[PDB]
Design an enzyme around this catalytic site. Structure first.
Site, PDB file in Angstrom:
ATOM      1  N   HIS A  41       1.125  -1.239  -0.038  1.00  0.00           N
ATOM      2  CA  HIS A  41      -0.230   0.018  -0.175  1.00  0.00           C
ATOM      3  C   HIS A  41       0.626   1.368  -0.446  1.00  0.00           C
ATOM      4  O   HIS A  41      -0.033   2.307  -0.202  1.00  0.00           O
ATOM      5  CB  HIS A  41      -0.819   0.275   1.006  1.00  0.00           C
ATOM      6  N   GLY A 143       3.248   5.475  10.467  1.00  0.00           N
ATOM      7  CA  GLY A 143       4.451   5.182   9.924  1.00  0.00           C
ATOM      8  C   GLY A 143       5.311   4.485   9.920  1.00  0.00           C
ATOM      9  O   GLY A 143       6.169   4.223   9.937  1.00  0.00           O
ATOM     10  N   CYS A 145       4.289   1.449   9.402  1.00  0.00           N
ATOM     11  CA  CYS A 145       3.729   0.380   8.138  1.00  0.00           C
ATOM     12  C   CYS A 145       4.844   0.003   7.989  1.00  0.00           C
ATOM     13  O   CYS A 145       6.095   0.802   8.124  1.00  0.00           O
ATOM     14  CB  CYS A 145       2.776   0.842   7.381  1.00  0.00           C
TER      15      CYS A 145
HETATM   16  C1  LIG Z   1     -11.150   2.292  20.720  1.00  0.00           C
HETATM   17  O1  LIG Z   1      -9.830   3.096  20.904  1.00  0.00           O
HETATM   18  C2  LIG Z   1      -9.172   2.835  20.353  1.00  0.00           C
HETATM   19  C3  LIG Z   1      -9.335   3.880  19.011  1.00  0.00           C
HETATM   20  C4  LIG Z   1      -8.427   3.625  17.901  1.00  0.00           C
HETATM   21  C5  LIG Z   1      -8.302   4.706  16.958  1.00  0.00           C
HETATM   22  N1  LIG Z   1      -7.272   4.249  15.453  1.00  0.00           N
HETATM   23  C6  LIG Z   1      -7.459   4.769  15.237  1.00  0.00           C
HETATM   24  O2  LIG Z   1      -7.779   5.707  14.373  1.00  0.00           O
HETATM   25  C7  LIG Z   1      -6.594   3.886  13.376  1.00  0.00           C
HETATM   26  C8  LIG Z   1      -7.248   4.372  12.211  1.00  0.00           C
HETATM   27  C9  LIG Z   1      -8.783   3.253  12.339  1.00  0.00           C
HETATM   28  C10 LIG Z   1      -8.885   3.321  11.558  1.00  0.00           C
HETATM   29  C11 LIG Z   1     -10.326   3.919  10.780  1.00  0.00           C
HETATM   30  C12 LIG Z   1     -11.407   3.931  10.008  1.00  0.00           C
HETATM   31  C13 LIG Z   1     -10.958   3.086   9.173  1.00  0.00           C
HETATM   32  F1  LIG Z   1     -12.050   3.055   7.947  1.00  0.00           F
HETATM   33  C14 LIG Z   1     -10.097   1.841   9.212  1.00  0.00           C
HETATM   34  C15 LIG Z   1      -9.393   1.904  10.662  1.00  0.00           C
HETATM   35  N2  LIG Z   1      -6.485   2.700  11.490  1.00  0.00           N
HETATM   36  C16 LIG Z   1      -6.429   3.352  10.377  1.00  0.00           C
HETATM   37  O3  LIG Z   1      -6.204   4.941  10.791  1.00  0.00           O
HETATM   38  C17 LIG Z   1      -5.406   2.847   9.277  1.00  0.00           C
HETATM   39  C18 LIG Z   1      -6.020   3.034   8.239  1.00  0.00           C
HETATM   40  C19 LIG Z   1      -5.977   1.410   6.823  1.00  0.00           C
HETATM   41  C20 LIG Z   1      -4.244   2.728   5.799  1.00  0.00           C
HETATM   42  C21 LIG Z   1      -3.975   1.759   5.232  1.00  0.00           C
HETATM   43  C22 LIG Z   1      -4.891   0.832   4.994  1.00  0.00           C
HETATM   44 CL1  LIG Z   1      -3.998  -1.292   3.767  1.00  0.00          CL
HETATM   45  C23 LIG Z   1      -5.342  -0.252   5.676  1.00  0.00           C
HETATM   46  C24 LIG Z   1      -5.721   0.638   6.892  1.00  0.00           C
HETATM   47 CL2  LIG Z   1      -7.225   0.109   8.483  1.00  0.00          CL
HETATM   48  N3  LIG Z   1      -3.790   3.796   8.978  1.00  0.00           N
HETATM   49  C25 LIG Z   1      -2.575   2.807   9.069  1.00  0.00           C
HETATM   50  O4  LIG Z   1      -2.840   1.549   9.866  1.00  0.00           O
HETATM   51  C26 LIG Z   1      -1.401   3.521   8.981  1.00  0.00           C
HETATM   52  N4  LIG Z   1      -1.325   3.222   7.911  1.00  0.00           N
HETATM   53  C27 LIG Z   1      -0.895   3.740  10.752  1.00  0.00           C
HETATM   54  C28 LIG Z   1      -1.206   4.212  11.383  1.00  0.00           C
HETATM   55  C29 LIG Z   1      -1.775   5.437  11.413  1.00  0.00           C
HETATM   56  C30 LIG Z   1      -2.197   6.031  12.449  1.00  0.00           C
HETATM   57  C31 LIG Z   1      -2.188   5.737  13.643  1.00  0.00           C
HETATM   58  C32 LIG Z   1      -1.939   4.814  13.392  1.00  0.00           C
HETATM   59  C33 LIG Z   1      -1.554   3.574  12.757  1.00  0.00           C
HETATM   60  C34 LIG Z   1      -1.242   2.081  12.970  1.00  0.00           C
HETATM   61  N5  LIG Z   1      -0.446   1.434  13.123  1.00  0.00           N
END
Ligand SMILES: COCCCCNC(=O)C[C@H](Cc1ccc(F)cc1)NC(=O)[C@@H](Cc1ccc(Cl)cc1Cl)NC(=O)[C@H](N)Cc1ccccc1C#N
Ligand SMILES: COCCCCNC(=O)C[C@H](Cc1ccc(F)cc1)NC(=O)[C@@H](Cc1ccc(Cl)cc1Cl)NC(=O)[C@H](N)Cc1ccccc1C#N
Lengths: 302, 302
Positions: A41, A143, A145
């Site tokens: 990705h 970051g 990943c």
């Molecule tokens: C209940 O209390 C707990 C609170 C939890 C809050 N948590 C979050 O808000 C994280 C969110 C949750 C989410 C929200 C809506 C969706 F629709 C799917 C997932 N997750 C990402 O935003 C994903 C989005 C994404 C990107 C690329 C792919 Cl291929 C798949 C996904 Cl899902 N970003 C990544 O994972 C990045 N790469 C790395 C990253 C970036 C930011 C923060 C951590 C990380 C890490 N590690």
């Protein structure tokens, strides 16, 4: 004596971490011999992420679209391919710090060390288990990943996890180093749910044996139980069934302490039924399930 | 998101670990430039250990009494000296993998990573705090002496601990890298007792801020308290007094979460008075005190 969450020394993996940049996207890669491994990705824009066609997006890329950085030295990409959810970038320089290594796909309940990295640079190391629902309870920020999980056996590094994403619950999902996800997840930015998790029974039992080895014995009792009667209690408290293979795996710990496995199961049953009543085990106030029988033998005295 | 016991990457320290043998005694040493640092009790026999006169024992030694091994390659000792409780062995080869480094003597409540080693070879890494009673709750077996504790700041390794001994309680005692013990202990094989320990208040508070940053908020309340009224409760539950310097150190976490320090103290007071009532914080069923405010900022998102 003593018992700690213990990771493997990370140096051999530190020498393999690089930074991969495609467009405005930057994440970590794993540089072994003349190939860099990273989450595919990296080729996605923020808009591409909602529903990507990766074969489409990759065919629109060339080698010079990929910037690999090892320290400050840039590595020249000479080829690129896709294997499931990992991108492979052939570079023109073999990593001189390549350790002896293997790629392995682990089973739920197995543990590994994670070298958390940002922009190709290692920031910290910690221990994880692969949960029964195929997530890991990691510590990962934007970051991270491309950070990898690994075990080490006699100077051979077995890579078992590459980090891809954080789910809405805050837990983490990723692949083996051939790019196959653990669990049912897919690499797109949609809200994905893991199945309900369970406690790793064989690991809790291993950790109770660590406690005995370290002189915590207050939870032992004279009783024993059968595998069938124990498993009824396991179901009630959302523990994995105890198998005969897991009883046998606990053999060495059982023999070192003189406590038969099903004897220890009776102690665990009482702990599940009555709680701890203000007492701790190995400095913990709950039953710990991210130490395998191997982890205990490795860390504890003989 | 997520929160883990996180160590520093250990590679830069792994490149410095050697094996030191004097007679039938073998332990670990730290090889920096052309000097090997190790616990001076390597020169003691099992009989010498009960009441050693180290100046006596060392004057009876020569350079060829010391066998230093870096991997399989033996290093030739060309000089030897004593500095407090550490032995310094000059070798004829400067360590080409010497990192940028400093020796630092830490205060109680500070944390560091430990690279546990045996026969010069790194086996695992974990996080420790220096307890208020100047012991550490390590994981150490026979042969771990000479393992070091360290922090890393921008590719500079700050060594703060060298391991010397396990006390009868199973906790661990050692020195700074200039050989001065933490606490009142001495390097001889007698039963030594540490003072009664206390809980590291500023660290518990830091960890409650980590929990808020990670979305655990069930323990917050609307109340606040004064530093004086809080400290009365701290005394009652064997917590260190909260100082104004510690309030200020918690400033950045307080501002990031919008929760004033004395507001968080009121939450901690209620947690001390009522317990958790079956709930967990950051996956723990007790109040964790081995994360400093710096550890939380380093690991958590901004
Ligand atoms: C209940 O209390 C707990 C609170 C939890 C809050 N948590 C979050 O808000 C994280 C969110 C949750 C989410 C929200 C809506 C969706 F629709 C799917 C997932 N997750 C990402 O935003 C994903 C989005 C994404 C990107 C690329 C792919 Cl291929 C798949 C996904 Cl899902 N970003 C990544 O994972 C990045 N790469 C790395 C990253 C970036 C930011 C923060 C951590 C990380 C890490 N590690
Ligand atoms: C309550 O449940 C907890 C059970 C705790 C049981 N624990 C123990 O029995 C460990 C004992 C406790 C003790 C007993 C009688 C005394 F009189 C003093 C201390 N400790 C050592 O035997 C010391 C003896 C010693 C050597 C050299 C010096 Cl300079 C000082 C000392 Cl004190 N051996 C070392 O520390 C070695 N080097 C390394 C080592 C060797 C073996 C096991 C771990 C380690 C480690 N790490």
């Amino acid at each position: 004596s003593g018992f700690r969450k213990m990771a493997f020394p990370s140096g051999k993996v530190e020498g393999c971490m690089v930074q991969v940049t495609c467009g405005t996207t930057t994440l970590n890669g794993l540089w072994l011999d003349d190939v860099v491994y990273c989450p595919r990705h990296v080729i996605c824009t923020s808009e591409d992420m909602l529903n990507p066609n990766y074969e489409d997006l990759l065919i629109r890329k060339s080698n010079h679209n990929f910037l690999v950085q090892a320290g400050n030295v840039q590595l020249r990409v000479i080829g690129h391919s896709m294997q499931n959810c990992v991108l492979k970038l052939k570079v023109d320089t073999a990593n001189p710090k390549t350790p002896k290594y293997k790629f392995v796909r682990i089973q739920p309940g197995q543990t590994f060390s994670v070298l958390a990295c940002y922009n190709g640079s290692p920031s910290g190391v910690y221990q994880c288990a692969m949960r029964p629902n195929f997530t890991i309870k990691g510590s990962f920020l934007n970051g991270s990943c491309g950070s990898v999980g690994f075990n080490i056996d006699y100077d051979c590094v077995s890579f078992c996890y590459m980090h891809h994403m954080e789910l809405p619950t805050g837990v983490h999902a990723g692949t083996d180093l051939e790019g196959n996800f653990y669990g049912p997840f897919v690499d797109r930015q949609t809200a994905q749910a893991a199945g309900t998790d369970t406690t790793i029974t064989v690991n809790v039992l291993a950790w109770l044996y660590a406690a005995v080895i370290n002189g915590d014995r207050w939870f032992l009792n004279r009783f024993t139980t059968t595998l069938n009667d124990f498993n009824l209690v396991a179901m009630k408290y959302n523990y994995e069934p105890l198998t005969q293979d897991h009883v046998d795996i606990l053999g060495p710990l059982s023999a070192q302490t003189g406590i038969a496995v099903l004897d220890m199961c009776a102690s665990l049953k009482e702990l599940l039924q009555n709680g701890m009543n203000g007492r701790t085990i190995l400095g913990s106030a709950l039953l710990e399930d991210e130490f395998t029988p191997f982890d205990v033998v490795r860390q504890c005295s003989g």
